[PDB]
Assembly symmetry: D2
Homo-oligomer: 234 residues x 4
Amino acid sequence: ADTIVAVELDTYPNTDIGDPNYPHIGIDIKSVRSKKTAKWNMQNGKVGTAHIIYNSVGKRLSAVVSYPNGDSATVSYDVDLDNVLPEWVRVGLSASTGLYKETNTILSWSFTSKLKSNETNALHFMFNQFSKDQKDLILQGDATTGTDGNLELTRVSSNGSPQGSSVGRALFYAPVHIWESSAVVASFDATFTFLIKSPDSHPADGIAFFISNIDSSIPSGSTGRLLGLFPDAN
Amino acid sequence: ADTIVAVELDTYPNTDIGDPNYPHIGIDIKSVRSKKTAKWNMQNGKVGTAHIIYNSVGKRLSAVVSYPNGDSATVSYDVDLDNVLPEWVRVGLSASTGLYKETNTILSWSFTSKLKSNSTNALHFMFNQFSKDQKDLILQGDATTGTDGNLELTRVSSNGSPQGSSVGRALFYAPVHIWESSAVVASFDATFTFLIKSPDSHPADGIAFFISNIDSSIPSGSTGRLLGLFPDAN
Amino acid sequence: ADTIVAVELDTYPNTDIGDPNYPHIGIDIKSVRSKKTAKWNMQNGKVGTAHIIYNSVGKRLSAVVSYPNGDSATVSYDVDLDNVLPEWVRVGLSASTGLYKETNTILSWSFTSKLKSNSTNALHFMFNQFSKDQKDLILQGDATTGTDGNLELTRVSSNGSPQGSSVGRALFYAPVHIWESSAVVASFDATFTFLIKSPDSHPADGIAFFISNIDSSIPSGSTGRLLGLFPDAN
Amino acid sequence: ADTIVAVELDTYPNTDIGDPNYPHIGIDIKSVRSKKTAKWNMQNGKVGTAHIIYNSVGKRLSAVVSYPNGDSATVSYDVDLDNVLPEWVRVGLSASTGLYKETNTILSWSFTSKLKSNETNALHFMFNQFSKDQKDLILQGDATTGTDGNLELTRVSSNGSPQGSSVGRALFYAPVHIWESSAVVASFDATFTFLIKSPDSHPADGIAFFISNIDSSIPSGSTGRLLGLFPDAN
Ligand SMILES: CO[C@@H]1O[C@H](CO)[C@@H](O[C@H]2O[C@H](CO)[C@@H](O)[C@H](O)[C@@H]2O)[C@H](O)[C@@H]1O
Ligand SMILES: CO[C@@H]1O[C@H](CO)[C@@H](O[C@H]2O[C@H](CO)[C@@H](O)[C@H](O)[C@@H]2O)[C@H](O)[C@@H]1O
Ligand SMILES: CO[C@@H]1O[C@H](CO)[C@@H](O[C@H]2O[C@H](CO)[C@@H](O)[C@H](O)[C@@H]2O)[C@H](O)[C@@H]1O
Ligand SMILES: CO[C@@H]1O[C@H](CO)[C@@H](O[C@H]2O[C@H](CO)[C@@H](O)[C@H](O)[C@@H]2O)[C@H](O)[C@@H]1O
Ligand SMILES: [Ca+2]
Ligand SMILES: [Ca+2]
Ligand SMILES: [Ca+2]
Ligand SMILES: [Ca+2]
Ligand SMILES: [Mn+2]
Ligand SMILES: [Mn+2]
Ligand SMILES: [Mn+2]
Ligand SMILES: [Mn+2]
């Protein structure tokens, strides 16, 4: 199957597959079952920012998700991505809804990858606006691009209303050389801003930044808790 | 045909199609017939650096090609690329050889594009090493990468000898949103380092940084003086 | 006297010293009388963005001022800053009021200078928030920072009314190496956002991004039309 | 006393003050006795690169030192710099010699600090060439800027012989806002390349990248094992 590294913003506690019992940020290493999570107070209708940092030297992948009021959740996990990911990846954003739903609107997304040495290859991109025809994004599933200049990872009605049973991803068009055996530093960071809104009995299921093999597609049966990322909950 | 914007480092004077009567740098707007050129002292077997800058605000596309000894050639041309390129492009490097030849070796290539509203979309990439399998490059024609870490735009026979009638291009894999209706600034810059060596009677034909439609292909019969860029010399 | 290169967002037409008879953006080289201006529709109480770009290849000092509604004014002047500016400079933002006044509120300020040859010396700074004690800014005259996170270049009264006869500047703390003899490309760009509000008839006098000798000081009497930049209107 | 956070490339084992008995990279928090070290194979006369990474999410101060042959040593220490450093700092490079000596030649140095949110303040500087009058560097002690275009932190004799009992530092001219209470991510990276040569088969004492109070100066008697950083070996 695909190889996945993700930072999930998991709005829906699927405790029966190992979620903690609250919305959480988590770090997923080849499994929807986060290796580390932190409780996350998802702020309905508020614009959140998720910052993801992989420090290749410290071998530590960290994430924070914050809201303008300063409330944040952080998670770090010690991992050497050289041992996890293929050298070449796509990077992307994934979201899903299930029986419960929420908007999984991306308002901005940037990524920087650097491979040093022995000089530097780098890739940076920044989206503060997404066009109707956002040619440098591979949209998968229900993901669509704006207006309102946004990336809507999952189905939302034109009049704002999240759809259940939706899964969508957007991967940057170019493959990213995420590590190299001879790379002294293979670091990357990503940030995205998001607006998760639910009228629902509960928001679900979340948004993930993910890093996948280049040919990654939405696994069959990965709406809901899986979060467009994984074929199963193992 | 394709829509081409290029900075050519034209090593071979094809005076019958309007080249000046010397190696030159030129700015090509939809035609191999440079809109502006500057005499360029190509330094055989030395590593040169081409810096290309497009100032969206000043509407000026500028290039300098320099060598470590300080010798440089400069060309500017006033142009509004909004009126020239499609909104979405690929960027790349092209080189060709004809009846005469040269190595068209790219040692590094970086590109930065920014679309500014007040919010910014940006793309930056940097290649200081090219891998044998450089997945974020579209190699066209004779272009190859590695394992010496270089991008060889045209055929070079392994003991280092350039091949005649060779054309090759490397385009960045992702499409580039190079201008937008709504962009107050749609600037970009590109840098590449190159090694043109010719054992010959003359080097030919040159290297170009180019910006083309996304689906740009080497036009048929564009080895030689057409630099892998144009179908004809109009 | 200081050496001043400035981009002025001149809100008040001082036609007696060669302002055109409208608000304008201007390129100033060692005179407050801009070498080039463009008519500027200043939008009272709206956040404008000024982008300023220069490189030593094109040698075109360009500036655009835009507002979110999409109105922009652009001015460019070819000028070889090697022959104007000292090698080392400070960069800054300056504003003034005279008989008439306006808030000259700076909301953000970014600047990048680069000196390139082989593959670079660079400086980049970005302020999206100014601190009450912004230790990397030299505030001169009436300029103040914080706690609203803004830089107020000129005097704003407690009731929000801007004051007349005010001048203030902020320069980045470090000297900037703006050109270097052996640099193949010396480039800078600057971006700032500003909020010019004038409760009535008329806003004055303007805001400028400037580059000056490192010890640059507000010239005495440089309120008003001298924009905190020039000792006189010559 | 100054507050010092440093990454030391310690060439000389001072086992009497708790160095391990081999050249090492160390993370130093308010003591010369590194909180963490890794064994470092210092390659005399080869150009090394140190990369130093920290962000306030992962709070892992990481450093790698590498050489072009691909030998590297890495050290990381989780430390909450919010609780160590003043909010504003200067950043610098320091080196020393004592009884034994080495050139402590800096060939490049770059640095980026960013404070996100809710947007970004950033500082970036890069020196690949140092100048004789490098106005954006505060040189302390024996530190000199060339040509050769290098920063020589410690005294090197006319005949190229490094001198003993030398200490010198270069700090970037502007204060750096290293953390901020409301910032979701405060990050810094530093890289420098260095050339440590000892004719005397006995190199000492090392080079450090350091972050200190803005008024940091070379502690008296901080030659030798104190690396120009600490007043004592506590
Ligand atoms: C065993 O009963 C299950 O109940 C849950 C929730 O009622 C449901 O989960 C679905 O919706 C959630 C939230 O969107 C997702 O996390 C799941 O993948 C799934 O789609 C099950 O379907 C069952 O009814
Ligand atoms: C009419 O005679 C032509 O002369 C030139 C050169 O002798 C030749 O051009 C070919 O080679 C050059 C140099 O590589 C290229 O610029 C051209 O495109 C072409 O391939 C013509 O073929 C004829 O000989
Ligand atoms: C002519 O005497 C003055 O009247 C002018 C206005 O014409 C005034 O100018 C001051 O204010 C303007 C607008 O703010 C500035 O551009 C000038 O530099 C100056 O400050 C004079 O001060 C007298 O009142
Ligand atoms: C013990 O008396 C000293 O001998 C030591 C060497 O053990 C010497 O130390 C100096 O040199 C080392 C290596 O350069 C530094 O690490 C020390 O700080 C110091 O400068 C003493 O000075 C005496 O010679
Ligand atoms: Ca879940
Ligand atoms: Ca030609
Ligand atoms: Ca005026
Ligand atoms: Ca020691
Ligand atoms: Mn989860
Ligand atoms: Mn030509
Ligand atoms: Mn004016
Ligand atoms: Mn030590």
